[PDB]
């Protein structure tokens, strides 16, 4: 075997050549924080949350995109790795709106969770925030684009998995707006999985909008019957009433997606 030897916090691990730093850390049971990375999309490399330290190297590397080299010690819990995470979380929460109570992603938000786990605990931002114009891309996906962190999981999903090529970023700089640029209605058969792979509340389920909250739901693991694919789903119930339907990750059927009828 052509496995090369890399080190994750001093611990040796044998990886295939071409393996990213994030997967080399995943093999030892360590999950690097990420926002744009998603293992079924392509690698964007732009949320800059996976900035990990390789020792004897005076620059942090993007772990979702950087391939490993033989002999690297990937310092996942080092000081400048943690400073990189706190700084990038600070810039992510600079213009992010104070919507956590009125947001359907609260309690199931990656931005909240790894701001608690990897970010700082207070704000140095003493300025005005941006307010991004909302869009209408269908009766299924509620669009609140002030909450967007421009991670382009939308665009990679609609480009690669749904195969639509109609979502995209318009603008340049802090005025860059993910959308369709026109009053276009993103109706695929897979148009609801962008609610799954939005890490923030910028794309939320419009039938599930405002109705429940993820800590009080009971996750029941069931099967789809809308089609003969047999999509593994989660039925989440609150007080004996069906609240939504989430996918289950099953590699051999529906990798982590479901259709809009199922959802």
């Amino acid at each position: 075997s052509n496995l090369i030897e890399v080190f994750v916090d001093g611990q040796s691990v044998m990886v295939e050549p071409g393996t990213t730093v994030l997967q080399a850390c995943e093999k030892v049971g360590m999950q690097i924080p990420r926002f744009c990375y998603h293992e079924r999309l392509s690698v964007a490399g732009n949320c800059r949350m996976c900035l990990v330290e390789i020792e004897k190297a005076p620059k942090v590397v993007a772990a979702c995109a950087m391939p490993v080299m033989k002999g690297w010690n990937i310092l996942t819990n080092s000081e400048k790795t943690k400073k990189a995470r706190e700084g990038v979380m600070e810039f992510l929460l600079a213009n992010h709106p104070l919507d956590c109570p009125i947001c359907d992603q609260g309690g199931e938000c990656d931005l909240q969770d790894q701001s608690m786990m990897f970010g700082s605990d207070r704000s140095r931002f003493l300025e005005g925030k941006r307010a991004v114009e909302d869009k209408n891309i269908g009766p299924l996906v509620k669009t609140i684009m002030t909450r967007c962190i421009q991670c382009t999981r939308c665009i990679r999903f609609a480009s690669e998995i749904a195969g639509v090529d109609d979502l995209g970023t318009t603008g340049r700089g802090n005025d860059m707006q993910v959308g369709t640029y026109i009053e276009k209605m993103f109706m695929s058969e897979l148009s609801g999985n962008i609610i799954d792979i939005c890490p923030v509340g910028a794309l939320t389920s419009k039938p599930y909008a405002f109705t429940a909250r993820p800590w009080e739901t009971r996750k029941t693991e069931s099967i789809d019957v809308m089609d003969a694919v047999g999509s593994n789903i989660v039925v989440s119930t609150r007080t004996g009433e069906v609240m939504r339907i989430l996918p289950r990750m099953h590699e051999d059927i529906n990798e982590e997606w479901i259709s809009d009828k199922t959802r």
Binding site: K27, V28, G29, M30, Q31, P33, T76, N77, D110, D113, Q114, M116, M117, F118, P214, W215, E216, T217, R218, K219, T239
Partner: protein
């Protein structure tokens, strides 16, 4: 790390590591692990056959003199094949120190009663019998202490539900408080509160 972080007590940590080596080499027949936590609390992990020798040693040795039983506790951990974790919290008034003696049993192996060492345990391990089902052999008066008199099942076991299996109401037919199966007017809402992101890297368990 000055104002908002707890100050670390390295002196008591080194003293308890030395005394843990002391206990581990005086009594190697029973001591399995010795560990000192980062907030400097010594733990002696023993075999369940060494309840009386370890506690008598700590009560009577001149370098221990743990004359006071503070607390005695079981902990149900169902993923272990010896699911109960009987925990002895001792107090030395001479050396101004505390030690934690920990052992184990399952549902069917009895722990030897420590009332011949500490008479404080006469209600504590009685409570452990009442709450967990751990039988204590050679106990003076072992019976229930907290539950209702006809109460079946051991409540602090983790396979026991929060509300029980029966509830009480007064029944005017039989003119008597009766026991009928529990039916809540509002079910206890279970909250899945655990974050999916890892909180502490120092406690990361190695994968398979």
């Amino acid at each position: 790390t000055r104002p908002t972080v707890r100050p670390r007590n390295d002196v008591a940590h080194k003293q308890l590591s030395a005394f843990g080596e002391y206990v581990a080499e005086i009594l190697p027949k029973y001591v399995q692990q010795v560990q000192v936590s980062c907030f400097s609390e010594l733990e002696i992990c023993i075999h369940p056959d060494g309840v009386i020798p370890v506690l008598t040693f700590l009560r009577d040795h001149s370098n221990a003199q743990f004359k006071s039983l503070a607390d005695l506790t079981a902990v149900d951990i169902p993923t272990r094949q010896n699911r109960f974790e009987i925990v002895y919290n001792l107090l030395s008034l001479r050396f101004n120190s505390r030690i934690r003696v920990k052992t184990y049993t399952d549902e069917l192996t009895p722990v030897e009663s420590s009332v011949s060492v500490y008479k404080a345990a006469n209600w504590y391990e009685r409570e452990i019998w009442d709450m967990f089902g751990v039988f204590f052999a050679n106990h003076p008066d072992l019976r229930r202490i907290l539950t209702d008199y006809g109460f079946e099942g051991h409540p602090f076991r983790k396979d026991f539900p929060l509300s029980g299996y029966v509830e009480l109401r007064y029944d005017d037919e039989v003119k008597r408080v009766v026991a009928e199966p529990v039916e809540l007017a509002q079910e206890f809402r279970k909250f899945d509160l655990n974050s999916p992101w890892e909180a502490f890297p120092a406690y990361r368990q190695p994968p398979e």
